[PDB]
């Protein structure tokens, strides 16, 4: 009496992965390639739907990571390769209007550079930071990337502003947006909605802290695989952002040196006025309140009566031990020891020392660096902290106290805090069900 | 009365050419880029059908040749380019524990090379063979590629092992596999089968000897486009493999020279043992019985009572006169005059071998690759599964036939593997009359 009927277009999805395409409203990320995004993003709420999500097993973070790396490598291709810059550098210390904090940080180098004519050289000079040069034993110096890999110089016409990009699913696929509040990294979501494209995600590269990210809806959320594992990083999301102001009062000057036919090297000229160390300011009251909220959530996860102690980074490279910035064109490396220094039981601002490096390896890759050319004028970087990347130590059987230190070593954690609400599924329109619908000859 | 009917999905195919994607279970051929092969390759045996095959007119050979050339050119692009090496090389002979056969083959050159700094230069030493070194002033030598093209140093992390690759036809196309023995490569095949992918085709590069190939099923098979034509190479397939042991007991040492910022040049540092010439060992018993089977199959086509002689290569370049191949990474050029030296009527053979670093693969001009030296003793074992012979004419043939090895192009080497495959285009649309009238 029952015949298996065939239905097409049934609302059935299957968890899988695919190659998503970008959408935006030149930059390094080539948002000019991302297709346009309609001004009316469709968002249909799915009542009575309980879908299981997973932050760590999500494939969107890996795809976006590969896309960002590919866009960076493609953007550095039409620029100037700084291969003849690796020469013998005769550097001297810059003691003109220097401060006590900047003693030895900036070095005034002089070297023989090539000209447009292959039969003659030129005597030019430039200012390099201490982190960009190394002695080969005035003294003879050499860039730190000469013995590893000669890299290209970043094009000044191309900016590093992390404008948001929207990841959209192709035909036959859908993106499930979890609108449930107080939702951690895993577990089922009782409020799932569908969207054709994700929200505006800014590809901001940062270490130990999250900048210009998405804020929490109601309270501070602590996300990790499980708190029993110390090797897994702890992702924190703030509900109220705290303002952070980074700047450099040096007022640098850009000097153009034509090293060859059609290519030029943007060197650093003389410093205007006094030289002061780059710093960053964080409000003391807001940071204390945010640390109190984070301590409350960590106590809720680890049990009450725990002495939550915050410590600075343990050790390692400068990229994992310092906070990395990217705004205007100069890459910063700020010492965040003043923020993570407290102990919790039961107009003032924090000035953090900061350093600037020109030759960087932000993707933690050996053999492909990038030279950031200097920019003129005083840089004023104003942003807000929306999260942290903490790491807990062992602590042994002593559960009366726990030490939390900033973490890093993986850029995927920065984008994981933004893609926690999305998931890619495969729409399955074919379905079979019995009905009294039978064919007739 | 009969009315036409439309049938969709009929088993009808037509010969056509297509772009066959590969299939495979860090590498030059980029095996990681290929799709994963089927763990259970389905092979449907087609009964009562006879399909005409053509070994010499197969488009898969040309497609494979272009694919191997493209992969070879793409694999050399992400590593070091050796343009800075065309300089005056003050060289001299090695003469340290040489063995008379290697008197001037190895040379100890010295030259001025750049360093990590653009304005700093240095003097380094390197061991270069006489094959890739030419005198520029009649003690001052230079590389043979200095007046041809700047060679590209091969990537040291990328291996040259010919791992098998499977060629698969896309949707709407099929590969017909002829499972009939005694096939000479041309003509109809009374036993064909449909396969979605071919078997393991190892892209082994070899001249005058088919190494690591597919053996015959019953007896030695001899295939040629025209037996009576001397310009057509004769392809022989063995039913049993002939083991060959090639080695290099020099025990070279590899050192890295900072050719520039971020790039290093791998040069032969020094020898820490007795310098001996490379050689390959082939047992004369198996080679004798194999040549007996070959001469029997040759007499099967050229008639009885005629004598057949085997001579070495006539002359020309070293790539066509010597058996060139790859063994562990280093490129060998062995003299096979000892193998093809006999006359038929009615221990181990030690073949002298030479090693060259600057090579011009695929017989191209303007594109060369420098093979970096490999430390340690290189030894490999291969299977001689076939030969590429060449015949010459004479006045009334004088009841004699002379066969010499043929250093042809790489298409003939891969043709011995794709001899039982062809590509057909499926035509599912068909019409036939039936006593059926559609209603109105």
């Amino acid at each position, epitope marked *: 009496n029952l015949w298996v009927t065939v239905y097409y277009g049934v609302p059935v999805w299957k968890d899988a992965e695919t190659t998503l395409f970008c959408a935006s409203d030149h930059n390094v990320w080539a948002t000019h390639a991302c297709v346009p995004t309609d001004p009316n993003p469709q968002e249909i709420h799915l009542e009575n739907v309980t879908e299981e999500f997973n932050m760590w097993k999500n494939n969107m973070v890996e795809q976006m990571h590969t896309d960002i790396i590919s866009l960076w490598d493609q953007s550095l291709k039409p620029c100037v390769k700084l291969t003849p810059l690796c020469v*013998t550098l005769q550097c001297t210390n810059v003691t003109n209007n220097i401060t006590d904090d900047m003693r030895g940080e900036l070095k005034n180098c002089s070297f023989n550079m090539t000209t447009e004519l292959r039969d003659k050289k030129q005597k030019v000079y430039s200012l390099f930071y201490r982190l960009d040069v190394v002695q080969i*034993n005035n003294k003879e110096y050499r860039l730190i990337n000469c013995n590893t890999s000669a890299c290209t110089q970043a094009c000044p016409k191309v900016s590093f502003e992390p404008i948001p990009i929207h990841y959209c699913a192709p035909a036959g696929f859908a993106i499930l947006k979890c609108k449930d509040k107080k939702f951690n990294g895993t577990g089922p979501c009782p409020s799932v909605s569908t969207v054709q494209c994700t929200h505006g995600i800014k590809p901001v590269v940062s270490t130990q802290l999250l900048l210009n990210g998405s804020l929490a809806e109601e309270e501070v959320m602590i996300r990790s695989e499980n708190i029993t594992n110390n090797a897994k990083n702890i992702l924190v999301q703030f509900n109220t952002p705290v303002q952070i102001n980074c700047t450099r009062p040096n007022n640098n000057t850009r000097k153009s040196i034509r090293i060859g036919p059609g290519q030029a090297f943007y060197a650093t000229g003389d410093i205007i006025g006094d030289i002061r160390q780059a710093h960053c300011n964080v409000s003391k009251a807001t940071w204390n309140e945010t640390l109190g909220k984070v301590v409350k959530q960590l106590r809720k996860h680890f049990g009450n009566n725990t002495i939550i102690r915050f410590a600075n980074s343990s050790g390692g490279d400068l990229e994992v031990t310092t906070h990395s910035f990217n705004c205007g064109g100069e890459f910063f490396y700020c010492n965040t020891s003043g923020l993570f220094n407290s102990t919790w039981i039961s107009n003032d601002s924090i000035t953090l020392p900061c350093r600037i490096k020109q030759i960087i390896n932000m993707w933690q890759r050996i053999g492909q660096c990038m030279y950031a050319p200097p920019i003129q004028g005083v840089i004023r970087c104003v942003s807000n902290i929306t999260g942290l990347i903490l790491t807990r130590d062992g602590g042994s059987t002593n559960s009366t106290t726990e030490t939390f230190r900033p973490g890093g070593g993986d850029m995927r954690d920065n984008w994981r805090s933004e893609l926690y609400k999305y998931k890619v599924v495969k729409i399955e329109p074919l379905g079979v069900a019995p009905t009294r619908c039978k064919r007739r000859v | 009365n009969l009315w036409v009917t439309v049938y969709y999905g009929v088993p009808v195919w037509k010969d056509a050419e297509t772009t066959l994607f590969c299939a495979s279970d860090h590498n030059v051929w980029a095996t990681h880029a290929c799709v994963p092969t089927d763990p259970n390759p389905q092979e449907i045996h087609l009964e009562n059908v006879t399909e005409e095959f053509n070994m010499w007119k197969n488009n898969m050979v040309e497609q494979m040749h272009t694919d191997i050339i493209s992969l070879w050119d793409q694999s050399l692009k992400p590593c070091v380019k050796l343009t800075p090496l065309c300089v005056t090389l003050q060289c001299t002979n090695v003469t340290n524990n040489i063995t008379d056969d290697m008197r001037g083959e190895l040379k100890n050159c010295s030259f001025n090379m750049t360093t990590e700094l653009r*304005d700093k*230069k240095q*003097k380094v030493y390197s061991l270069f063979y006489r094959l890739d070194v030419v005198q520029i002033n009649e*003690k001052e030598y230079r590389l043979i590629n200095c007046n041809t093209s700047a060679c590209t140093q091969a990537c040291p992390k990328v291996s040259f092992e010919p791992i098998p690759i499977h060629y698969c036809a896309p949707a709407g196309f099929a590969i017909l596999k002829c499972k009939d023995k005694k096939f000479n490569g041309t003509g109809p095949c009374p036993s064909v089968s449909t396969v979605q992918c071919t078997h393991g085709i190892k892209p082994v590069v070899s001249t005058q000897l088919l190494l690591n190939g597919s053996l015959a099923e019953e007896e030695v098979m001899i295939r040629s486009e025209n037996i009576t034509n001397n310009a057509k190479n004769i392809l022989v397939q063995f039913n049993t493999p002939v083991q060959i042991n090639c080695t290099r007991p020099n025990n070279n040492t590899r050192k890295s020279i900072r050719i520039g910022p971020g790039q290093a040049f791998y040069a032969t540092g020094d020898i820490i043992g007795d310098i001996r010439q490379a050689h390959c060992n082939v047992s004369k018993a198996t080679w004798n019985e194999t040549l007996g089977k070959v001469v029997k199959q040759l007499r099967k086509h050229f008639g009885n009572n005629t004598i057949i002689r085997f001579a070495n290569s006539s002359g020309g370049d070293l790539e066509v006169t010597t058996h060139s191949f790859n063994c562990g990474g280093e490129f060998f050029y062995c003299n096979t005059s000892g193998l093809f030296n006999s006359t038929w009527i009615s221990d181990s053979i030690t073949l002298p071998c030479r090693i060259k670093q600057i090579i011009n693969m695929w017989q191209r001009i303007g594109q060369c690759m420098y093979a970096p030296p490999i430390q340690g003793v290189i030894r490999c074992v291969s299977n001689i599964t076939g030969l590429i012979l060449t015949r010459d004419g004479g006045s009334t043939n004088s009841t004699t036939e002379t066969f010499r090895p043929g250093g042809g192009d790489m298409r003939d080497n891969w043709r011995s593997e794709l001899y039982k495959y062809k590509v057909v285009k499926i035509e599912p649309l068909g019409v036939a009359p039936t006593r059926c009238k559609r209603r109105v």
Partner: antibody
Amino acid sequence: QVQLQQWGEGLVKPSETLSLSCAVYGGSISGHYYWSWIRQAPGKGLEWIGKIDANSASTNYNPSFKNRVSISKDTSKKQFYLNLHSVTAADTAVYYCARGSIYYEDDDGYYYSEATYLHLHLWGQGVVVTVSS
Amino acid sequence: QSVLTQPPSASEAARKRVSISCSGSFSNIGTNSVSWYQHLPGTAPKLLIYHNGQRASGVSDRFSGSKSGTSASLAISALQTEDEADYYCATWDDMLNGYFFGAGTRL
């Protein structure tokens, strides 16, 4: 311009360690230079002993003084020393501490810093030694 | 007996030209520069010719040096009375990793 003076023991008994000290005045222990020691016996020619790099701690010695000579460098007080263990009666020679420039500039804009262009420009005043009772 | 073969002595009158030869191997002369030194009894040796063709500071125009592959030579044009000294040819040996002086040509 640059003066080099050396001092040591004029009479040394057989079988102990012979120590020689040479100092630099007007210059510095830095740059592309090779601080070497050269001695010559009466009736024999100049014989090289060893060397020490100015910008590195590496050193090389003559094979005739296999595992018998040692040369140290102290860049703090700009001095380099020479030590010869188990002095025999064949060591009576006038020891000279010399500086060997290894810098060379070709016709182009390149430069070389290696032992290929080694040449001893300056020499010490020379100190004689006697190996007897 | 040793590297850097040089004749034990040379005798020639004044006002004319004399040549002192010095030959070695490929590792010492063929790939490294040859240096000439002059030594008098009682004083320290002095550098005469360096880089096979460059004259040291304070050296008269009469001294001249040249190198031809494996062999090297020192030319003394218009010999004088105070030229009676010991001339040593030195170069670096890449095979033995060390500086080696000649046998010493007594003029």
